[PDB]
């Protein structure tokens, strides 16, 4: 019920920005949209600034805010996201591309003024150049799962894994391995759930106008299993 909660109770505008280099390829993406957590509602676009995106859009969803999950009524005592408010939390996981590379990700995630900024470092490393990654043979498709938060103690934050299955263009499947970790910024308190899931539903677009390399994404996310 927190100062933390009360934060998200309208439609937050949400600013991504992102630093990136897959084996020594740089690249910058800034995100622009909202959330609405009552709904469990976000609303993005993102732009690659340097130029062309040297990974497919879709491997990126999961690093480009899960403050915005819609918790039930009955849940609200374990939305550690949004308990760790305005202060932030860092979110740190790696994703291991199966006989592909892996990417290593830094994100912090809290508020500047009424903006919920979440600013993401990615090292990429031991791709093959002419991969699925690499050599973009992902397909632009949708991304829905369902990821089981624990608690992790010793650490006063939350930890999880889940596999995201992209699709290639052969009809064949690149798993991409998530291990996640998140722990707060502040010393404050904050809340520490019971084991559950969020579950995320996601489409993928493109803006018709726009000519640089992007992503316009909806998302709806949703705590459950209590």
């Avoid at 622009?32 to 990974?55: M, N, Q, R, S």
């Avoid at 374990?78 to 591309?97: C, L, N, W």
Wanted: proline share 4%; glycine share 8%; aromatic share 10%.
């Amino acid at each position: 019920m927190s100062k933390g909660e009360e934060l998200f109770t309208g439609v937050v505008p949400i600013l991504v920005e992102l630093d990136g280099d897959v084996n020594g390829h740089k690249f910058s993406v800034s995100g622009e949209g909202e959330g609405d957590a009552t709904y469990g509602k976000l609303t993005l676009k993102f732009i690659c600034t340097t130029g062309k995106l040297p990974v497919p859009w879709p491997t990126l969803v999961t690093t480009l805010v899960q403050c915005f999950a819609r918790y039930p009524d009955h849940m609200k005592r374990h939305d550690f996201f949004k308990s760790a408010m305005p202060e932030g939390y860092v979110q740190e996981r790696t994703i291991f591309f199966k006989d592909d590379g892996n990417y290593k990700t830094r994100a912090e995630v809290k508020f500047e003024g009424d903006t919920l900024v979440n600013r993401i470092e990615l090292k990429g490393i031991d791709f093959k150049e002419d991969g699925n990654i690499l050599g973009h043979k992902l397909e632009y498709n949708a991304i829905s799962d369902n990821v089981y938060i624990t608690a992790d103690k010793q650490k006063n934050g939350i930890k999880a894994n889940f596999k995201i299955r992209h699709n290639i263009e052969d009809g064949s499947v690149q798993l991409a391995d998530h291990y996640q970790q998140n722990t707060p910024i502040g010393d404050g308190p904050v809340l520490l759930p019971d084991n559950h899931y969020l579950s995320t539903q996601s489409a993928l677009s493109k803006d018709p106008n726009e000519k640089r390399d992007h992503m316009v994404l909806l998302e709806f996310v949703t705590a459950a299993g209590i």
